[PDB]
């Protein structure tokens, strides 16, 4: 395993910068596509294949996709995200 890392990332025209996919099942919420140029890209950290495992606090680790989103959009203007980088599982899911 990976050790979990922390992001600070703030929220931008678009957005954060990225998109989620899993959420069910027993997937848990994974980064899927970084915009190229946003916040996420521009993070230097956040990647394809982490698991979010929480927002400001939220733990996202058991949370459906639409819980998932709900979080990252009331997040605010800065956004603490913790992640995991776990490419075997993604790959597995995804």
């Known amino acids: 395993p990976r050790e979990p890392r922390r992001i600070v ?6 957005g954060l910068g990225f998109n989620i996919v899993g ?3 027993g997937e ?12 996420a890209d521009l993070s230097g950290e956040l990647r ?3 698991q979010i495992l929480s927002v400001n606090g939220v733990d996202l ?7 998932a989103a709900i ?5 605010g203007q800065t956004v603490t995200i913790i992640a995991q980088y776990k ?3 993604y790959s597995r899911f995804e």
């Open 9 to 14: 990332i703030h929220r931008g025209s678009t």
């Open 23 to 25: 959420g069910e099942d």
């Open 28 to 39: 848990g919420i994974f980064i899927s596509f970084i915009l190229a140029g946003g916040p």
């Open 48 to 50: 394809k294949g982490d």
């Open 61 to 67: 680790r058991n949370a459906s996709h639409e819980q």
């Open 71 to 75: 979080a990252l959009k009331n997040a």
């Open 87 to 89: 490419p075997e599982e």
